[PDB]
Design a protein around this ligand. Structure first.
Ligand SMILES: NC(=O)C1=CN([C@@H]2O[C@H](COP(=O)(O)OP(=O)(O)OC[C@H]3O[C@@H](n4cnc5c(N)ncnc54)[C@H](O)[C@@H]3O)[C@@H](O)[C@H]2O)C=CC1
Ligand SMILES: NC(=O)C1=CN([C@@H]2O[C@H](COP(=O)(O)OP(=O)(O)OC[C@H]3O[C@@H](n4cnc5c(N)ncnc54)[C@H](O)[C@@H]3O)[C@@H](O)[C@H]2O)C=CC1
Ligand SMILES: [Mg+2]
Ligand SMILES: [Mg+2]
Ligand SMILES: [Mg+2]
Ligand SMILES: [Mg+2]
Lengths: 332, 332
């Protein structure tokens, strides 16, 4: 893997330019504040204050010492526009408040490549397109920069038109602080497809249904739901913290030998070759555009499947018993 | 669930009694110190110092202000004996150092039910047998007790010879702080079987192989292993931390709508009715004694399956890439 560190990004390449950071959410408040104390001219594109949220966010941008402009005004101002609004809204915001104000040599930036990769945003060919995706949440992107240590990041450039697209996004990477720890060269295609696959098969879909299937197994066998909650959900955090810290090996070293033996022999019975074949199918739906199509069509008819499955999950017994037991532990 | 609190336990039922805590590891150190701070008469049963580890543990007891004794002397001093050495060691320790010193009316306590439930320790009928199983690791049992909050626990009674087994166990649970948070009534059978099931199917076996299968899917399809690490392992902690604090619903509220839709529709494809049927078979092996027999036989011939499978795990690419990447993240 190709790594880019400090001695690979020249922050002077941005002297005399403006960076529009559209949005001030998790990545927006973190990344815009990072580029300000890195010596770069930053404008923060938001909506005109109209209700309570758009005012409170506009006021907090001022409180941190940055300049807010309406999205069309920050986009007219800057030659480097980084879109950090929500993914499901990016197509409308770009089309209306960003697209008519693009010039040659301007560089368009993302932190997740779904919209570029699946053709929902198609910038003009005379425009640089880059991605800098940090591997840490917004509050950890901002808190770690103030501590002189970077968070690792992924770098991607989708269209090199000014001949310096890589160096230009590489400049943005140092501006937010990812080049300190090290930055991995990826593509929009790889970042988008792996992000969706991980979400679907492991981080969100896989683990929630593993948890629920375990809980259901115990409850259907007649064990107390309160006991099943502890053994299929609550105790998972301790285990995953260890994997996070020191890999699977640290976790297996820290649990009892009986648990490690059970892990080694039963894990592959639960997640077996049939499961691995299904993960391959799920990946193929991500690679061939049909998942993206399905999501996009779902949003166009008012999200009936998303609402129905969401509500079905909220009615699950594990959520009911969980609220009761979590009360008893206010220290979470 | 039948719940017990501080009001249901009478610490004065232990007046004039000496409690021996056998072991001083994760649960032993926390439970012994807690019992001491609650004004009870505690001795810690340890191997006489014979090497760096046993010298240090003995000195730790003294440093904490508690009284260490060799295990047989601790047993002879105490009327309540809490066995907190590793589960795979308890039968031999019990047979050699505890059993010959039991008197009618003594109480034998556990924090996990395996050895009583699967008949590896068979106490005389004249001895009360109870369990108080905290639902937190020892360092939290201790920390939460210091802060005047408890950790939740389970209470079970296996043999009531005196008629006071439950009251003794409840007094013990109050002494270590578990009735402060609340203690759930269960049985040795239920605690043992749900503990083994959760470890095998969800917490350790299920989640490690889910992680590995996701990682292998990505690597085999040609993506970069460093990227697969982030998307299949590294950011699972953020997800699980949210499930831990506020259930599946809080996590789904906190991820993007694309992830939640991917979660709701793909989760049950990965963990499906075949997976749930295999979980039922795994539970059946825990319920019919055959897993316990398999584990005990494995331990009797020097752990060759445990050692072979552990090593194969240690050679996996996810552990090699993970070590490289985690070194780039010093804050671990
Ligand atoms: N949550 C995370 O930590 C990660 C997110 N990303 C990606 O960065 C992008 C932004 O992510 P988040 O910080 O979580 O976004 P967010 O959901 O926290 O907020 C987005 C910002 O855009 C504003 N906004 C909302 N609707 C708007 C509209 N119609 N017009 C103009 N502004 C609007 C919001 O006020 C908010 O300040 C996404 O594409 C995401 O996939 C990349 C790395 C990790
Ligand atoms: N670790 C945890 O957080 C949980 C553990 N439990 C149960 O607590 C009990 C004790 O478990 P842990 O504290 O985790 O074990 P541990 O591995 O943390 O500590 C074991 C203790 O036993 C001592 N010991 C080891 N060999 C000995 C021997 N031959 N003779 C005398 N003493 C010896 C050790 O020096 C150490 O003091 C087990 O039944 C466990 O299943 C129950 C709740 C959660
Ligand atoms: Mg991700
Ligand atoms: Mg447990
Ligand atoms: Mg266990
Ligand atoms: Mg995502």
């Amino acid at each position: 893997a190709r790594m880019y560190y400090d001695a690979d990004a020249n922050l002077d390449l941005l002297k005399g330019k403006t960076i529009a950071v559209i949005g001030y959410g998790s990545q927006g408040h973190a990344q815009a504040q990072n580029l300000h104390d890195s010596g770069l001219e930053v404008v923060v594109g938001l909506r005109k204050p109209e209700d309570d949220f758009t005012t409170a966010e506009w006021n907090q941008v001022v409180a941190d010492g940055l300049t807010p402009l309406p999205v069309d005004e920050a986009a007219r101002a800057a030659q480097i526009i980084q879109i950090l609004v929500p993914d499901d809204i990016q197509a409308k915001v770009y089309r209306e408040k960003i697209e008519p104000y693009l010039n040659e040599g301007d560089a368009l930036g993302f932190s997740h490549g779904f919209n570029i990769h699946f053709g929902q945003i198609v910038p003009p060919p005379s425009v640089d397109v880059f991605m800098v995706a940090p591997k840490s949440p917004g509050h950890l992107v901002r808190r770690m920069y103030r501590q002189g240590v970077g968070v690792p990041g992924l770098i991607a450039v989708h269209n090199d038109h000014t001949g310096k697209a890589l160096e230009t996004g590489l400049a943005y990477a140092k501006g937010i602080g990812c080049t300190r720890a090290g930055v991995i060269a990826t593509t929009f295609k790889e970042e988008t497809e792996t992000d969706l696959f991980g979400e679907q098969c492991v981080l969100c879909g896989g683990v929630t249904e593993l948890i629920k299937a375990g809980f259901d197994t115990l409850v259907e066998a007649g064990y107390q739901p309160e006991i099943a909650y502890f053994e299929c959900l609550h105790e998972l955090k301790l285990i995953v913290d260890l994997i996070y810290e020191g890999g699977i090996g640290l976790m297996r070293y820290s649990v009892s030998d009986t648990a490690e033996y059970g892990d080694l022999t039963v894990g592959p019975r639960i997640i077996n070759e049939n499961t691995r074949a299904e993960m391959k199918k799920v990946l193929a739906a991500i690679q061939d555009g049909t998942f993206a199509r399905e999501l996009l069509l779902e949003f166009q008819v008012g999200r009936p499947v998303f609402s129905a499955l969401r509500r079905k999950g909220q009615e699950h017994l594990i959520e009911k018993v969980g609220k009761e037991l979590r009360a008893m532990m206010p220290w979470l």
